[PDB]
Amino acid sequence: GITGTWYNQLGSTFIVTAGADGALTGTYESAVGNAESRYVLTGRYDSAPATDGSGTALGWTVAWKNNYRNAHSATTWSGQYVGGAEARINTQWLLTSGTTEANAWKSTLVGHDTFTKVK
Template identity: 45%
Template structure:
């Protein structure tokens, strides 16, 4: 994704003619992008939210990667303490049916543990979030149960005061690797409104080639 292409998308949504990008109408752009593109765009939104505008130079700085590529940021983990290896069939980038992406590190702090990053294509979860979880070490290379959680709190988007937990199983189907999960999203609510604090659903992740 180039800065000029992203700027054009924003300008088409906002009808801006002064060389800067307005905040209004940005959701339309986000909805049209893939997960990594949306993460880049959300970094732009975070900067716009502070000043009300963004210059093309600032936009170019954010869009440093080559068109069609995106460099994953490093998880906030100490690689020196990561002494266990995660199976190659599990480590890597996974994409769900909504376009959300997660990256699972190839190493972890302990056997059966996973660490990584999550980028949601839906909701108000901008940029990347740390994920932590566990997987069944008694399963074979391409199957077994696992689960992970994401606390929706990061620098670009702040604290959403919510948490999502995924629990599911890994499968190999026609040579492709999948994770079928059920998730719970819990948002902070008062005791009186606790009844409406939790959403549930299902996600299917496919491992990127």
């Protein structure tokens, strides 16, 4: 149930394909909704999850560089798919920016995102 369009709370959109081999490929759109705000996502998911009501572990990365903008940063999301009635991807993320060694201590933001298939 991972393949599809997912929306976070903040209004970002993640279009993903889950391949039989464990590969995630797709696009992440920061909230705007134009070509300029689309970035390649790659990831991995558990292709053989536990049959006991456990969620499916997954993760993906976006480098914030496309043909229009380079933020010299990358976010990774680490999380799990929950195939509920209204399914959800619950994640925590790390956004690392490229820095000098002096600013390396303040390079990494952390947060959390919930995604649904409902805008």
